[PDB]
Amino acid sequence: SQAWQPGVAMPNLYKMQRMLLEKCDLQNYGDSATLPKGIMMNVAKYTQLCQYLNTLTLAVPYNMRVIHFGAGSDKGVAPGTAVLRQWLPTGTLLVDSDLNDFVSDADSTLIGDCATVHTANKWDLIISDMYDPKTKNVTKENDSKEGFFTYICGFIQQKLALGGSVAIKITEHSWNADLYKLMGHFAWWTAFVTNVNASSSEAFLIGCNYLGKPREQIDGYVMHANYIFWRNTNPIQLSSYSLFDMSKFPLKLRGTAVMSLKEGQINDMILSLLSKGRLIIRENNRVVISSDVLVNNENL
Amino acid sequence: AFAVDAAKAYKDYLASGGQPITNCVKMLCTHTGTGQAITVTPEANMDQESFGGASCCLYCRCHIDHPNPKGFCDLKGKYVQIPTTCANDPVGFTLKNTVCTVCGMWKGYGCSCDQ
Ligand SMILES: [C]O[C]1[C]([O])[C]([C]OP([O])(=O)OP([O])(=O)OP([O])(=O)O[C][C]2O[C](N3=[C]N([C])C4=C3N=C([N])[N]C4=O)[C]([O])[C]2[O])O[C]1N1[C]=NC2=C1N=[C]N=C2[N]
Ligand SMILES: Nc1ncnc2c1ncn2[C@@H]1O[C@H](CSCC[C@H](N)C(=O)O)[C@@H](O)[C@H]1O
Ligand SMILES: [Zn+2]
Ligand SMILES: [Zn+2]
């Protein structure tokens, strides 16, 4: 019955295991979903990711701030940004970024390594589709990767509003131990596999409602193995069924409250509202961002 | 005294037989919407497709300045409905056709203001 869903999330019993990391080998590896005429993979992917997110307790305030990393593509456009804007309430502030130049529907776009990206502001929702193609050059044991996953883990701890949520793309080899550990700083977490990319080890690590502190301790090395175990023993039929019904697609405008709070004010009652998607905590000042620029004169 | 008519150039390249700009981002949608030309979310009716606007605008795609004296973009950040019969070239269509200031539909592809 999974085929009529947008995709499939890691069942809790696999999260609870203490598996060891195996190579990932999927029955349908390299199979491709049939897509609706003229529809790009990344539109279908992001659509199903948003459809899955409609089922969670996302905070959705007025003047929502969303930021999308790795939104470029080899096409020079941002298919996933287009879906996020469609999904998101009209007027949602949407910043995106990628190392390579692309044209976007985002309110602002920064080009460059994400580590040159800076903002004073906290955010309500962070999306990362960042992936290093050199990850394909597997020449050793599959260890936790740093690089952009280091920036991301920092951005979340520094710039994610309490009650905010994240969706961060990983694969068998594109993953990071601390990101998993940080998944436990959310009220709830999963690994979600879109049905149109079910023949991939790709998942989106989704943290639901940030709590700024660990709710549960997660060994990230162990959980990535648990994730591979799950994928290795649970083949997922490619399916694009859920792309056809867009009638309930738009993110509910919950009009969620926003409050600037100290760390002394975060009690168990406040914490419970965070965890229910009923509260966001952060400043509501103007949103300013920047990209660092290295200056050099090469002449002589 | 010199600027470049980007619009004319693509209109001539298409006329010569050139292949229209590809990789315009088509949205999934209900296809039961208003049918209006340019909108803040997909509004395709049964006879249209909805695309993200940036990807359909010639000035954004070619990295060139926009005709507005402000450089503002009519399409970026928005969605454009394209007659399904022309969705092979959304950049051509948007450039050549004009939107009714009154009802919001494409003049000649929905605008029934005249009668
Ligand atoms: C936009 O979205 C893109 C994708 O949709 C998504 C990833 O999709 P993927 O390609 O399927 O990834 P994967 O093969 O499932 O995992 P991996 O970490 O690349 O595996 C490393 C290496 O290990 C092997 N491996 C892995 N697995 C799971 C196997 C298998 N071998 C088998 N016989 N059976 C299997 O089950 C194989 O040799 C791999 O190469 O990431 C995006 N993306 C990918 N590449 C690029 C890119 N974006 C930009 N530029 C890119 N160059
Ligand atoms: N360190 C880094 N900083 C910024 N972007 C990075 C990065 N490493 C990889 N990326 C970007 O991750 C992207 C993967 S392809 C992304 C597809 C796009 N999100 C869509 O929605 O269609 C690449 O464009 C790549 O430039
Ligand atoms: Zn433009
Ligand atoms: Zn009219």
UniProtKB/Swiss-Prot annotation, chain B:
Cell compartment(s), UniProt: Host cytoplasm, Host perinuclear region; Host cytoplasm; Host endoplasmic reticulum
Residues the record lists as binding Zn(2+) 7: 57, 60, 66, 73
Stretches assigned to the ExoN/MTase coactivator domain: 1-115
Residues reported to bind Zn(2+) 8: 100, 103, 111, 113
Signal peptide range: none
Quaternary context: Forms a dodecamer and interacts with nsp14 and nsp16; these interactions enhance nsp14 and nsp16 enzymatic activities.
Role summary: Plays a pivotal role in viral transcription by stimulating both nsp14 3'-5' exoribonuclease and nsp16 2'-O-methyltransferase activities. Therefore plays an essential role in viral mRNAs cap methylation.
Protein name as catalogued: Non-structural protein 10
